[PDB]
């Protein structure tokens, strides 16, 4: 927990609000796929939240031509 950085409180709000169950056995590789998946779940949240933000408060966003 200390290594990857997450507090007991943070794992609890995840399995409260975000729906992701930290409660099973966690080894290295499962922790790996779960971090991937949990992070990706936030960019799926992003999508759904930027539909509630209907009003024009957009500074800049990712089209095609200005790529990193």
């Amino acid at each position: 927990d200390v290594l990857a950085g997450l507090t007991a409180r943070e794992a609890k709000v995840l399995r409260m609000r975000f729906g992701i169950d930290m409660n099973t056995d966690y080894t290295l590789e499962e922790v790996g796929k779960q971090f991937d998946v949990t992070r990706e779940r936030i960019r799926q949240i992003e999508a759904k939240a930027l539909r509630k933000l209907r009003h024009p408060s957009r500074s800049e966003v990712l089209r095609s031509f200005l790529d990193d």
């Binding site: 997450l6 943070e10 609000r17 975000f18 936030i42 960019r43 939240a49 930027l50 408060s57 957009r58």
Partner: protein, 89 residues
């Protein structure tokens, strides 16, 4: 119910943002506060717009503010430095 419980919630749910997906979604002022409103963490019946969002951290008891500074070293300072840097009036 309580102000500091809600502040504790917000800092918990944001600390997550900060270390998982990082400076990408945190950046955009609207997107950040919209992530908190998505899951409906409400206070005094009100969903936290930029007034109410900063005011629960700003109008906070010095001792309970410092408690967060104290215990949540990187987590509190994380949201702190980003909110005073990004979020104006």
């Amino acid at each position: 119910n309580k102000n500091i419980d809600t502040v504790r919630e917000i800092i918990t749910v944001a600390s997550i943002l900060i270390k998982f997906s990082r400076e990408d979604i945190v950046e955009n002022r609207a997107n950040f506060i919209a992530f908190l409103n998505e899951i409906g963490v409400t206070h005094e019946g009100r969903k936290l717009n930029q007034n109410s969002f900063r005011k629960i951290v700003s109008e906070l008891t010095q001792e309970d503010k410092k408690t967060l500074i104290d215990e949540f070293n990187e987590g509190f300072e994380g949201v702190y430095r980003y909110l005073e840097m990004y979020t104006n009036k």
